[PDB]
Amino acid sequence: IPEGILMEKNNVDIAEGQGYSLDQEAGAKYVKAMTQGTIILSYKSTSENGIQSLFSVGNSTAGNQDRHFHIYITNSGGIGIELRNTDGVFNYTLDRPASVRALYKGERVFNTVALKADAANKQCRLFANGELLATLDKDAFKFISDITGVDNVTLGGTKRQGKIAYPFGGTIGDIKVYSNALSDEELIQATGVTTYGENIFYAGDVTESNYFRIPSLLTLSTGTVISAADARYGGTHDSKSKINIAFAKSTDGGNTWSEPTLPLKFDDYIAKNIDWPRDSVGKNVQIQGSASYIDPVLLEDKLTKRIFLFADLMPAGIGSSNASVGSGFKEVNGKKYLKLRWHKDAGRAYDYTIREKGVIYNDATNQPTEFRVDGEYNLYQHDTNLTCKQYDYNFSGNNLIESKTDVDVNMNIFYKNSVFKAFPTNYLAMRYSDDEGASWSDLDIVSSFKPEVSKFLVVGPGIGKQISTGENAGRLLVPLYSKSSAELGFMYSDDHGDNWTYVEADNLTGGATAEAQIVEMPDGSLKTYLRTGSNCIAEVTSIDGGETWSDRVPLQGISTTSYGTQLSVINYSQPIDGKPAIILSSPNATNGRKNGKIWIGLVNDTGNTGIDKYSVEWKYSYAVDTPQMGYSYSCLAELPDGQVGLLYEKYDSWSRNELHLKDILKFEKYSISELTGQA
Numbered sequence: 001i002p003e004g005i006l007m008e009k010n011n012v013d014i015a016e017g018q019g020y021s022l023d024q025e026a027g028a029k030y031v032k033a034m035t036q037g038t039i040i041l042s043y044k045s046t047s048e049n050g051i052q053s054l055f056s057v058g059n060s061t062a063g064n065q066d067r068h069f070h071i072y073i074t075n076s077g078g079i080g081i082e083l084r085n086t087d088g089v090f091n092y093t094l095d096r097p098a099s100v101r102a103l104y105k106g107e108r109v110f111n112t113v114a115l116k117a118d119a120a121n122k123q124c125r126l127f128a129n130g131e132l133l134a135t136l137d138k139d140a141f142k143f144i145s146d147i148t149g150v151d152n153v154t155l156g157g158t159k160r161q162g163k164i165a166y167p168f169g170g171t172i173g174d175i176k177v178y179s180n181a182l183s184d185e186e187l188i189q190a191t192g193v194t195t196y197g198e199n200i201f202y203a204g205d206v207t208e209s210n211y212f213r214i215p216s217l218l219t220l221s222t223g224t225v226i227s228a229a230d231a232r233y234g235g236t237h238d239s240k241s242k243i244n245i246a247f248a249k250s251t252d253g254g255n256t257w258s259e260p261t262l263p264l265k266f267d268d269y270i271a272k273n274i275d276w277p278r279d280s281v282g283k284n285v286q287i288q289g290s291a292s293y294i295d296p297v298l299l300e301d302k303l304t305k306r307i308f309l310f311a312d313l314m315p316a317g318i319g320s321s322n323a324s325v326g327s328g329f330k331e332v333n334g335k336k337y338l339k340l341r342w343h344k345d346a347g348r349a350y351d352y353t354i355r356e357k358g359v360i361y362n363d364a365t366n367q368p369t370e371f372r373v374d375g376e377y378n379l380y381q382h383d384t385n386l387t388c389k390q391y392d393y394n395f396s397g398n399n400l401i402e403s404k405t406d407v408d409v410n411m412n413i414f415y416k417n418s419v420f421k422a423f424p425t426n427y428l429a430m431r432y433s434d435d436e437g438a439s440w441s442d443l444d445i446v447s448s449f450k451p452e453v454s455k456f457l458v459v460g461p462g463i464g465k466q467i468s469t470g471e472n473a474g475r476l477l478v479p480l481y482s483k484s485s486a487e488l489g490f491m492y493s494d495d496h497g498d499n500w501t502y503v504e505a506d507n508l509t510g511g512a513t514a515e516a517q518i519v520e521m522p523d524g525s526l527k528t529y530l531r532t533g534s535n536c537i538a539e540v541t542s543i544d545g546g547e548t549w550s551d552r553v554p555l556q557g558i559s560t561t562s563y564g565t566q567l568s569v570i571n572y573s574q575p576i577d578g579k580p581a582i583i584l585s586s587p588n589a590t591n592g593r594k595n596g597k598i599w600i601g602l603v604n605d606t607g608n609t610g611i612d613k614y615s616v617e618w619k620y621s622y623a624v625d626t627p628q629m630g631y632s633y634s635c636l637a638e639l640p641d642g643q644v645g646l647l648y649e650k651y652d653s654w655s656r657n658e659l660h661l662k663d664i665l666k667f668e669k670y671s672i673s674e675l676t677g678q679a
């Protein structure tokens with residue numbers, strides 16, 4: 001077998017289920033005997049077949065259907081390989097879900113992939129569109145030379161007992177087969193020739209997080225576009241993990257983004273890039289003793305130009321599912337204060353409070369203690385800052401070891417090793433900025449209003465809303481949801497963010513995940529669209545600036561799942577078809593988070609008054625990709641030009657098979673012309 005390229009073919013159209021024989025190529029005899037090597041190919045799939053082999057080499061004869069090697073893709077964007085010679089001899093597999101796409105802006109696009117079988121390092125590596133997707137190490141390295149009775153080299157399928165299995169349909173732009181193992185750098189470069197959309201946050205940036213989730217995108221009145229997202233360090237798991245909130249901005253209409261910052265973060269556990277295991281056991285493991293921030297909301301007060309960032313604040317080892325019932329506050333002298341437990345007191349004895357100027361009081365004696373906290377909630381004993389050892393986390397087999405290091409960090413009331421510990425329920429935190437993120441104010445815990453009967457009261461991620469007209473013009477609103485007397489709720493402010501008031505929008509006690517977003521009607525009334533625990537998105541209306549809301553009404557015509565997914569709905573500044581318009585984003589499948597679509601709803605005045613004054617006609621729907629392609633949480637924003645920006649999760653964030661994937665948060669832009677099917 002010679003060194004270098006054994007075979008190359010260009011522009012090969014393959015009819016679905018037909019395949020294409022490469023048996024008469026000059027180098028087929030070498031390819032059928034490869035001991036190692038590299039395969040790189042450019043393709044465009046036009047088929048909806050479940051599994052589609054791009055390239056294969058194997059034994060096509062009777063009873064030898066498990067003797068072959070193939071690189072394949074799935075209609076849901078997965079990519080992988082199978083190296084087989086019957087299960088008793090060997091069956092090596094490697095794959096990564098949501099690695100390729102099928103359609104972009106209405107047309108089928110090319111993806112570039114590569115497999116590297118490195119004999120010297122006894123390792124296999126998969127690449128696609130400029131990214132290293134997965135790695136497989138084997139002590140008993142095997143390749144094509146190890147398959148018994150190889151008799152074919154095929155494009156677009158795998159020959160099994162004389163039939164074309166895993167049928168591809170489309171075009172193989174180019175394929176190059178090398179007997180040598182090219183470097184990872186060469187493959188990143190080669191496959192990086194085809195990319196779609198862009199990343200704002202990514203594995204390797206200064207956040208030091210390998211994973212991101214829960215997008216927020218907002219264009220400011222100044223033209224600057226800002227964004228935020230969960231920087232999920234310990235895999236893509238929800239809280240009871242180590243998560244910080246990342247932030248970035250664009251001053252050129254969303255073309256390039258700044259170096260990300262971490263406006264909301266904890267230091268009890270180190271922030272580091274770590275590859276979370278994706279095996280059936282390790283994938284379920286999550287960080288146990290870390291405090292975190294989760295689910296961001298961005299909002300601008302157009303009058304003052306001030307911006308706000310809200311997020312849920314989870315004490316050490318807490319998440320919504322295990323938060324304790326209670327407000328986390330205690331009323332003394334008619335004023336609500338954050339309550340604390342001295343580490344040497346009884347397990348449930350919260351006998352202290354943080355009062356004026358952060359001074360901690362002994363509630364029993366009503367006398368100040370020798371401790372206090374600053375605007376960051378870090379402890380001080382007699383003006384000396386307290387510290388504790390930062391933790392690190394590493395896997396030893398399937399076990400996650402969380403151990404103290406030698407690094408000292410400031411002791412915070414939300415940390416597990418703090419001398420004074422906060423009540424283990426969730427909180428609502430916020431910071432404001434008057435310089436578009438160059439600096440943020442002190443930590444403001446606004447959840448003193450948390451109902452004492454509630455398990456959790458959290459935010460509906462995305463953006464908030466400021467009323468632009470009517471009697472309540474100027475009012476700031478942020479959507480909330482809880483497990484208490486009400487499910488859907490809101491917090492509003494009439495003094496530009498200085499103080500907030502909580503509102504219960506219903507009397508549902510089930511605690512379903514009612515994540516919602518708010519839109520304003522022409523007269524200042526409001527309509528809120530929300531995820532529900534039923535098979536539909538609900539709509540509620542308010543005629544009094546969000547103080548009271550109508551009963552939930554199903555949003556007719558827009559399909560969803562029973563468990564549901566967060567949605568994004570925004571106001572658009574110009575009329576569409578001459579009418580006021582709102583734009584909605586959400587996966588459209590009835591099972592699985594996939595088939596994302598952007599809808600345009602036109603506001604019509606029915607001629608009635610009150611809650612029934614307006615009716616929204618969802619006139620247009622725009623499919624982002626093919627039906628099986630993953631699409632989860634998202635956030636829309638009207639960019640300074642006429643475009644609509646979209647920051648979304650391009651994978652199924654609910655699936656137990658798609659956890660811990662890197663670089664799935666993508667940013668794309670669409671014109672109203674495109675969105676209205678008008679090309």
Ligand SMILES: C=CC[C@]1(C(=O)O)C[C@H](O)[C@@H](NC(C)=O)[C@H]([C@H](O)[C@H](O)CO)O1
Nearest residue numbers: 214238239294295312319320458513653
């Ligand atoms: C595993 C994903 C949970 C999540 C969701 O995607 O449904 C994401 C979101 O971040 C999360 N929020 C909090 C505060 O935990 C919720 C939540 O975990 C429940 O799943 C409610 O849907 O939904």
